[PDB]
Amino acid sequence: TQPALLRLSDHLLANYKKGVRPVRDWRKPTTVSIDVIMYAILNVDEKNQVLTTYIWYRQYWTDEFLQWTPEDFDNVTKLSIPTDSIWVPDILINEFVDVGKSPNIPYVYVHHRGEVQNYKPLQLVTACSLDIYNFPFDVQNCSLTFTSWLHTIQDINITLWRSPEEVRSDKSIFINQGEWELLEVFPQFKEFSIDISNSYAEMKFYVIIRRRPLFYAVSLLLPSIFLMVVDIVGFCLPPDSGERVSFKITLLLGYSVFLIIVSDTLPATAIGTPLIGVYFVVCMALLVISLAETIFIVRLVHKQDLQRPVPDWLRHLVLDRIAWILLQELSSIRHFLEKRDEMREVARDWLRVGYVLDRLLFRIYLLAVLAYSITLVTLWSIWHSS
Amino acid sequence: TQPALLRLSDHLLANYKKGVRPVRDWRKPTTVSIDVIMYAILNVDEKNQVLTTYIWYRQYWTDEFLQWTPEDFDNVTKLSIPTDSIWVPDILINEFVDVGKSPNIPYVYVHHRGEVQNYKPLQLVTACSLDIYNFPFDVQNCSLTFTSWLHTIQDINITLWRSPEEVRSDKSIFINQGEWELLEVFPQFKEFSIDISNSYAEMKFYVIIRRRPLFYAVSLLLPSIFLMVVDIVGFCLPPDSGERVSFKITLLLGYSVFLIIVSDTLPATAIGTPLIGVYFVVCMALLVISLAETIFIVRLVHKQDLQRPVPDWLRHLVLDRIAWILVRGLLQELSSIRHFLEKRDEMREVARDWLRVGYVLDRLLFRIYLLAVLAYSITLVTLWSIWHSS
Amino acid sequence: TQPALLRLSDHLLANYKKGVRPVRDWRKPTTVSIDVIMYAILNVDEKNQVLTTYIWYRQYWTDEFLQWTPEDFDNVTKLSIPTDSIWVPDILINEFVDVGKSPNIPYVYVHHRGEVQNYKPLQLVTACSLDIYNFPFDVQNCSLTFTSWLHTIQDINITLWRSPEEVRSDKSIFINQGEWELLEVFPQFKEFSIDISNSYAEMKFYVIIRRRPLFYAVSLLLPSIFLMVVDIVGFCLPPDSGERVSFKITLLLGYSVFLIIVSDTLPATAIGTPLIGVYFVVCMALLVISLAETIFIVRLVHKQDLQRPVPDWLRHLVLDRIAWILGLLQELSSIRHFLEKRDEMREVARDWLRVGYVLDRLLFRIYLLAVLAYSITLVTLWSIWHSS
């Protein structure tokens, strides 16, 4: 006679009105069951506050007019047809920026009761209120809000293909090799309503993810700690007014190097910044300050009575800063030497200064390094808590 | 029988001439109501002088031919049909650069009188004349001018869906997490005309936004304040003939260093610049002049190159100004040695008068560098007040 | 009866053959009037030698078939129809790189005689031979050459909607708030031809613009002037070698720091260089040569009087240019004098030393001349820029 698969298509698509919502009673809405499966997390631009992700999307609805009796058409039950030849809902995402990378699937499946199945990928670029308060130990929940732009709930309601529990624990396909880990895909339904006349169906998808901080645990924290811990020694083991300048220039050498390479690495939003960057500049600042101080006093007392103890108005301020922390010719010729190498007139003034002042920068550098070590474990715990 | 939507869709679109303006009297125009809702502010490139936005746009007009009696078609009043099957106006934005990200909504709603509704989003890239004069405390009104490119006022007028007051105080959806803040979306109608023959409709939308300057407040102002105050104790502690040079070149590095981290943070435009950068280099300018003038006095008079340095004609010209603002033969040889120990001991000349004039200028720049820091602090708060006023 | 617009569109588009050039005598061409209005200048990439602009474009031509009597259609004279339903010429810009930002206006107006007006925008990206020989004060003459790619003069000639004088002075819409300024849009017609058989029409629009130099005048020229004069006071009043060399090198650093912070915003193209960069490196070069000669003699002759009285040949040449520039007591006195022995010893060489030091003021004289030319060159650029 003729192939059933041609005998069926012409029976359906002929007298089919694409563009019309496929129902007989307009009062009845057509429902769309949704399924979302993550596949990858391509990029996270913390500056532009967006998220590039690749998911495997599918949905099904019902078409009253795409029905047939299989027994006539060689007992065929399923069928594939072009997607441009039938009605399709205007489902989208609210949180989108760019789209067009997602190709167009030119086919969909149909069953003899009107169930239409449409599979597709989605290269999405969404917006997300990202946070980098804890940069390496960062956790974020970005949302994908599926809905129809035009049709209301009286025409299009949205539901789920599967159970929610199957949607949360769905690691059946996901690239764990990337920077980010997947924890959950938590959905939620809502009846969106911005005004009175109309309401709209929404189906959210809270995409929770977690960073893999090990790379950053090494390249940042150990160098910072290895330098932070060693800058401490430059205050205590050696004396103020000494060659400890040699100890700090070399520290600052690698320290600035560390700041340079990492500034190329960690993000920099205008909305905020992480805390570890706050501790680096501090521990950089005091190093320069103590170094800028240490070079002065060796150079001040290097000379004898060249400038006498002029600024003795601030030693009053020093007073409780202590408390806060805690041959008759040959006669004169030979006497000219002990007169020469006596070093009390300017030294003692600016020396007691440098010592007591040194304990300040030391005692402060201790805590900036302390909090840097204290806060680090909390972010790990929170990162580990999830 | 058959269903209603099929009986209705064929009733309308059959013998429907898409491309024709949908009226019976051509003398009558076709108005289009408008509504705009700001969803987000995605990017503000102060260099290229553009703006990126996401808008939830809707409009409606009337189609005299898309009319029916609902009672025949099962009392159906509403309907959804494809957008490419009917006439649509050529509403566009003059202040546009890029389009293509905004997708196409294929469907539109229709009522039994002709009211066509078209909801859609708009990912826009507009051109806007910005100003970073008051860089952190910036406020900018960028305009969105909706109009038809071809059709005139006689064919297409433009109107508002809602009241203008509702449009301004519209924050039902907006991302307050982003860098910028929203204040108003002020509309305004105009009858644009550029020649004599034709006049065109316009409906503007002045989008007023405000920056969240807190992050920039600590990263640039506190450092700039930090460098400024310590430069000024550097004036009083050392007098001229001393270790000023110990401290100026110390801190001239700080301005030089700090001035780098702003050049990448601060948006590097070309039409203009903010005022803080002016105060940064102006404060650096004195930190050179106060340093250079200090060099020519101090290590010079100590060097004793000039035994008669003082110009009295010019020192007078200086002091004209300051007044307006304010064995026996061996028994001697030790004393001979002591003359050569006094050589080894110290030095002094008549340069103290010449050198006194070096002192007073340093204490005069104290009256200047202090001044520049003053206006830098005074100008700061009025910007905050303005930004706070909006 | 029935509406007129609906009754009319069937009268025209039915039996209408899109794709065919709309004339009755093929021997006659189809003229296309043109008009251009600038609206903004979006970007000028001196590196890639391109120009990004946004103009407002319109054109009209005559379609012999789109003709009707308005009396039979309710006295209606004008009509709007889609552009995809009619013939449209293949007008294009030759100096283009990328197009596609321009959206498509579907509708066009039609009159009862055949005039087919077509308004549209154009977001162009053209290729322009940009010159930054005079960077802050520069003027450019970029060309927008409109023509059909395929049809010849026998089918399509091109004219102007308006007069050229109106076109040049047209500034009804232009954003004067941007970086660049508009002066003129000069049109010009040509009969393009590259081989013998085929000739093609052309209408070039020479777009002249001008830069707003004030921002660059602040960021570059005053600091360069600022950093230049301090190298002059750092020469004369410190004739010494000790503090001179230090403060001179204190200057050469900030001289270099300024040299790079401008380099990021300075537009560097592989074709040519702006003159104000040429002056910075020359004044850097003399800042070094003056330093080289300075150290070449000082620590070798002055700080250590190593006996080098030999080179008077090397002063003969100098002497030319000076015309063309224009028992215990025995030991007590020993140690007592030994301190005086340890004082300075200005030998005859240190007198020879000073005749080489004379040229230190010659380089001063030359470095001064460089900074002078830096000023004379600037004003003539400002002047000619004012003339445009």
Add this chain to the structure above:
Amino acid sequence: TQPALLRLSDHLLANYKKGVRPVRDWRKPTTVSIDVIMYAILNVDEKNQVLTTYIWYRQYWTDEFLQWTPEDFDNVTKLSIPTDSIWVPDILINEFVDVGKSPNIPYVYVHHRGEVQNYKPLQLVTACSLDIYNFPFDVQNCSLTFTSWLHTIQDINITLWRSPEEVRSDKSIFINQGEWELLEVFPQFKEFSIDISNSYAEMKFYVIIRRRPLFYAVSLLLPSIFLMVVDIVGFCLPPDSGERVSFKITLLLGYSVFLIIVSDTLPATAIGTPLIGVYFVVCMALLVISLAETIFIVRLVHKQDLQRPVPDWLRHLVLDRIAWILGLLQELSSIRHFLEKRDEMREVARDWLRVGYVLDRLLFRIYLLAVLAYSITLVTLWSIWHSS
């Protein structure tokens, strides 16, 4: 009569139903033979973990309706027809990111029994789990998983055009002038089943490649080696800071500078570092600690008047290492005594120096060990790279 191609195309496309899968018994699937030919490797971003490539793709299937007896149509056996007029499978790649640079081929060949050969290029952008643990001597096998997005194995199975041996040894076209080298294209068939109801066909293509490490061998390894040896000789001869510290930190500058220059040379990812970057920071870190203890030694032994006496509980631990690792008259010369005392200087910490100075010799053993293993890895990396 009439042409054959014209008479033939009517015989087929008339009453043809594009969109229908071209078979008679739906129970039977339709197979798609596949072939892949590499042409170039264009870009490799280790940061974004993607890959850009250019391949020459072809495939064929069968169409039961596109059949004819060639004897009628002038013995014509082959034919070219457009792709838009016939059914086409929905074959794609799972590991895609962006596509659209690849153009569309508007023609397809067809034979007189249903074979439908479709050639096309593909400018792909694919994700790949890369690794730069062995940065210069790096190897990557990236996957190209071809499949249909919708249709199942029951409708569409996938097969190869050629044998896999032909596919692997296919360098008929490839640009060996690029940064990357090609080794193999290893295919593999699979049956994908994420769930129960449905199973899908797959045909992967493991694209194995190899870097050309020569340029990176020069710009990085020779300097790093050149920098490592020079810090070693600084540890043998000079025993104190005025002999040591002035030397080694001069290298710490260039060493640190070298660490900077490699970063902009290196590829920056976030999943894992190379190894050589570890040896650099380590040898840098070790260098710092040597510098650290060296200075504390100097302050107390060589500089101090009275120093921290010897606890020697720690020397008890350090010595265990060696077991494991191995009035006129005087008034005159009172001044001379003052001078003689001014010029002589010594303390007791020489004994306290010994326990400390040998730690220099101790850590010195490590700078060999690290710099040693720096080379040991670098050759097995070369070898395993060479073996591949």
Add this chain to the structure above:
Amino acid sequence: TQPALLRLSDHLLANYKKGVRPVRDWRKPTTVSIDVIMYAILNVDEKNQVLTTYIWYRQYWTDEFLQWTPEDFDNVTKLSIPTDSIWVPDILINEFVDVGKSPNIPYVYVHHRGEVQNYKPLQLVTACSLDIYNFPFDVQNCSLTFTSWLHTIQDINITLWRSPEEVRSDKSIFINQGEWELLEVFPQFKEFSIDISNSYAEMKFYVIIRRRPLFYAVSLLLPSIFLMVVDIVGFCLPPDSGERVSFKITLLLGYSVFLIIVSDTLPATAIGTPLIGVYFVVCMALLVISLAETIFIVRLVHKQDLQRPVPDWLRHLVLDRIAWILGLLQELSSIRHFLEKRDEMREVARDWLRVGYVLDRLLFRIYLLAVLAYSITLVTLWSIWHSS
């Protein structure tokens, strides 16, 4: 009666089967004459190894069905119709990356025998193996290979419109205001055959271009040459430890200031780099070493030189090296003579001087030698670039 174009366009396109190769005897091929005219070189990315160019393309073939007698249509011989209404071959460029910038021309010309003509532009982005060994004096031949993707030689052969001599030298349109100069566009026909069954046509176009090095010579060579010879003065005339440092310091600033500004300027490919980058780092490093070796000497000659008297084995080493290259009275005087010991430290330093001195007549010998080759290359590169 009726116009001719409407009477003609309906006579052809009615009963015209687009999608069919327009011939009567399928056994014949369909030739496609080709012509290529360069217009501009837009970009040359040495890093990504691509080439952005813009050409003016045209081709003509034969359509046996598009024929008419002009006498029956008002003696009309030519005609413009849409490209979308006729068969168009599948010509493409194999070595492309992305296309789509170029617009589509919706019209083509037709004559009364079948000679279809299709003018259009092309904004190409092709892959090319670019060498930058001779960076400023570069010469590069990139290939543009035109062919049909699907159709074979039996269906589509390719030829030229003009003679190759005309194509080889056609600067009738080209922008000589760019960085690159044009020399030749050499065509070449082949017959591609990757397998046994199918042979495909090809028409290559070797696009040979040349760089304009004048800008780079100023910005790179003269300063590098300038900062290559001033050091020689330091290397030669003063063996002094303090002065030579002060001189070598100043050069490092301008040299480092120079070395940065060139880095962004020149292209930094991964497969290779120009020779000019070699001598720079050499002349950079070798400056620091001399500056680094002097500071060792002065800091030890002055402070404490007799710690290590002189390592005689190293003395022997450098020795053979250059050899193969080539109670009151005198008690009062005792204190005075104590200062006569201050006249000059022990011979330990006089060898420690011989340590550092004799090097500088070698570091001089090598730096000058390195500067030699840097000058020798620059002229032979110029010669080749000039010969081309």
